[model samples]
Target: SLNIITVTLNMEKYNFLGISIVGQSNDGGIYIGSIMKGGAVAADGRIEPGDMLLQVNEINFENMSNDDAVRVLREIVHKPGPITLTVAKS
Candidate 1:
């Protein structure tokens, strides 16, 4: 979401301030869309497919969807994510 051209990375998620996209997850309730998007976690290094999601904005995401979860991510992709997280290509 940075440059005009789409990034080549396919398994990446959009992070707002080094955190997972804030929205509902399809797998269940709200959860991290992709660690690649959120950059990397500090304590965990990065969120994996099986990694247990703690919460969003310190709030427990119970009935969130991938779309709702990523809502904040898309916004950050346009602005916040870049501003907050230390984006690094892996």
Candidate 2:
């Protein structure tokens, strides 16, 4: 008889640039507020939706594509904790 098994740990599937502030506006493109149902964002605190994804790793988001931004996020996610952010609320 023979048996084999394998196990893999979650080595960080997703990346987070930083925390974002939540707010609202009028004469606007958006409303009704954003929400996150029971999950890590809840396990954490604040950080509701409808808030613009204003910044990344404390750098301006201009001139960066989603792919490029993702690459930059990965660059930090693999590093130590304490990632910083610079998000502005409406």
Candidate 3:
């Protein structure tokens, strides 16, 4: 079964969100590869490795390339306020 969850991180103080992502070549989806210690995602305690990332804020990550997904994540680090992530966990 797949469980959809939303994780919201406050990026106002930190520039790095402390998470690694991998793009699924066969399915064209993004997944959490790892979570760094002391990062917002790790601290939030909701996201986990292998979770499929569906959206970041208002941007859709489905069918997106690895490079494109990295670019979007990098851009989010610098933006102030809360960043919302929609993910699917199995």
Candidate 4:
């Protein structure tokens, strides 16, 4: 059930991306451990639990710490419209 995946989210829904980054994947990638029901991604039909977030807003996060990566995601707060996320299954 692992595969490369990409998704976009409109910040208007702010704080409601619906997916939770629980921890790192076996391959040393950040993992989306849970997805909220009826949340943004849950309705998209893509993005799944356990998926690894490879990049955010086109910025590569190859060796970033969870805290550092979250800092990058915060930049999206000022961005207008859809936010791009590159992810993959482990």
lDDT of each: 0.39, 0.40, 0.86, 0.73
lDDT of 2 by residue, 30-78 (tens): 2114434433233344444443443445664444554555566568667
lDDT tens digits, residues 1-90, model 1?
A: 331111222224433334454444445434334554334353335343333343433334355555654574455455432222222122
Candidate 3 at 82: error in angstroms?
A: 0.6
TM-score of each: 0.36, 0.44, 0.89, 0.74
Error of 2 at 45 (Å): 2.1
TM-score of 1: 0.36
| Best candidate according to lDDT | 3
Please provide the root mean square deviation of candidate 2 (C-alpha atoms, Å): 15.8
Collision count of model 2: 0
Candidate 3: 10-residue stretch with minimal lDDT = 22-31
lDDT per residue (tens digit) for residues 1-90 in model 4: 657777887666655566677555335868788889866678775888777889877788776777777767667645577877888876
Question: How do the residues 9-51 of candidate 3 rate in per-residue lDDT, one tens digit apiece?
Answer: 8866556778899875566588999999878888888999999
| Candidate 3 or 1, higher TM-score | 3
Which 10-residue window of candidate 1 scores lowest in summed lDDT?
Answer: 2-11
Model 3's alpha-carbon lDDT is 0.86
From the highest TM-score down, the ranking of the candidates is: 3, 4, 2, 1
Q: Could you list the CA RMSD of all candidates, in the order they appear?
A: 12.0, 15.8, 1.5, 2.9
